[PDB]
Amino acid sequence: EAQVTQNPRYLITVTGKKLTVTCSQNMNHEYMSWYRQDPGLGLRQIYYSMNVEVTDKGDVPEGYKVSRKEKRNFPLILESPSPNQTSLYFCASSLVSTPLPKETQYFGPGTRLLVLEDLKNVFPPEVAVFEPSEAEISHTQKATLVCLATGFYPDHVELSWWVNGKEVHSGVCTDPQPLKEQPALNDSRYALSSRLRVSATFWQNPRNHFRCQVQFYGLSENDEWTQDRAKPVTQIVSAEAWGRAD
Amino acid sequence: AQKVTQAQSSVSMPVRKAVTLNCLYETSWWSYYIFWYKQLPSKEMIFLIRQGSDEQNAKSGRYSVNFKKAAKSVALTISALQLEDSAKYFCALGDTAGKSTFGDGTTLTVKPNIQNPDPAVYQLRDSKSSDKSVCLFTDFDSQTNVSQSKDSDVYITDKCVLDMRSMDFKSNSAVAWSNKSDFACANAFNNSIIPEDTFFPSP
């Protein structure tokens, strides 16, 4: 099955600490390319490889090194990560360097890379579930649940809803980007909301269970931590609510 | 020079209609390619279609290309817009050896047709706590525009299109909450233009 895999998908690093981003494909693709997307802008090409052991500089190669030891792998090396290398990095691959009409060039899921002077501003989320109002139930015969994730930094988060242990997407809407709690500070924490709407009678069944889950991507065990508070590792934080008879 | 230009930073269009996205480029390359991509809100990147500089207008599915080589314009046309088409679309120029140059994209918002609007602002209490509440504006028309909060201690998100697939029911909604004293749901969206018949529950 065709897919492009990047590791890691989310990375928090300290300035000047060497790191390498991996990109791989099992389709024996000859051409693979790295891009960086700054927010609101397009993709700027860093390096591409027309085949194994062929490397050419793109538009923004500075501060990056690559290798193409085989077809499968095209790693992106950041010799000395600096704050201006914080970006969303995309690795792409294609069957041939000049694709035919029927052929697709596949893109990885993107790598959200954050380079910081220190990690003291990293905070995990607080999450709460807010039950639907009896007025919406009365007025529309529907029930909207709201989930609130607060106090987290950075916005390396994924939010999903799970109803009776099964993830649901029907009736779900999540904000496109997290908003800053105190926009003045660059180190402001973030918050994110989402809504799930079900039928009024479904909410009134007490056997139905509702769970909002926020996957937070943070530090690793490898990362050093000196502050008193709990180390903000990669973790899941959830809040739950049960249906309620009228 | 080497520039690709997407004039429309943002475009709004109703469901099932068609939309045309313009793309202009200046380049010293005389043999090249044009790529179109769709970036979902998840930021996932997706290849749609590629246009060869020596070929006729490429077409595939609901997408179609209007290649006008003389003006260096290669517009992509999307017909029968769906809610899933709401995304940021990118036009990209590539050469004969894998190099490429990207424009800065175009955000498309597809507005759904709300057939039975019922604008209302509801208050929701915390499953776990007290004081901690949230105000919910929902069921309004897609032509109603929610306004960024102008009070830094009150947080208000942009519009949000949810789709209850089982009922073929689409509705917009927006959320507002705050920590301040005497924050009330009637006051939350005063910075926006809410319908005059917006339901505010009295009991």
Author numbering:
A (entry chain E): 1 to 246
B (entry chain D): 1 to 203
Give the exact sentences the study uses for this entry.
TCR N17.1.2 was isolated by screening TILs from patients with melanoma for reactivity toward the mutated NRASQ61K neoantigen. Here, we report crystal structures of a TCR (N17.1.2) from a patient with melanoma that recognizes both NRASQ61K and NRASQ61R neoepitopes in complex with NRASQ61K–HLA-A*01 and NRASQ61R–HLA-A*01 as well as the structure of the unbound TCR. The TCRs are restricted by the prevalent major histocompatibility complex (MHC) class I allele HLA-A*01:01 (15). However, NRAS mutations dominate in melanomas, with mutations at position 61 appearing in ~20% of patients.
To identify possible ligand-induced conformational changes in TCR N17.1.2, we determined its structure in unbound form to a 3.50-Å resolution. Structural differences are limited to small side-chain movements. Overall, the CDR loops of unbound N17.1.2 have a backbone RMSD of 0.53 Å and an all-atom RMSD of 0.62 Å compared with the TCR bound to NRASQ61K–HLA-A1 (0.50 and 0.61 Å, respectively, compared with the TCR bound to NRASQ61R–HLA-A1). Hence, N17.1.2 behaves essentially as a rigid body in binding pMHC. We observed relatively limited conformational changes in TCR N17.1.2 and its CDR loops associated with binding, which would result in it being an easier target for traditional modeling approaches [e.g., TCRFlexDock (44)]; however, previous benchmarking has shown that AlphaFold’s complex modeling performance is not affected by the degree of binding conformational changes.
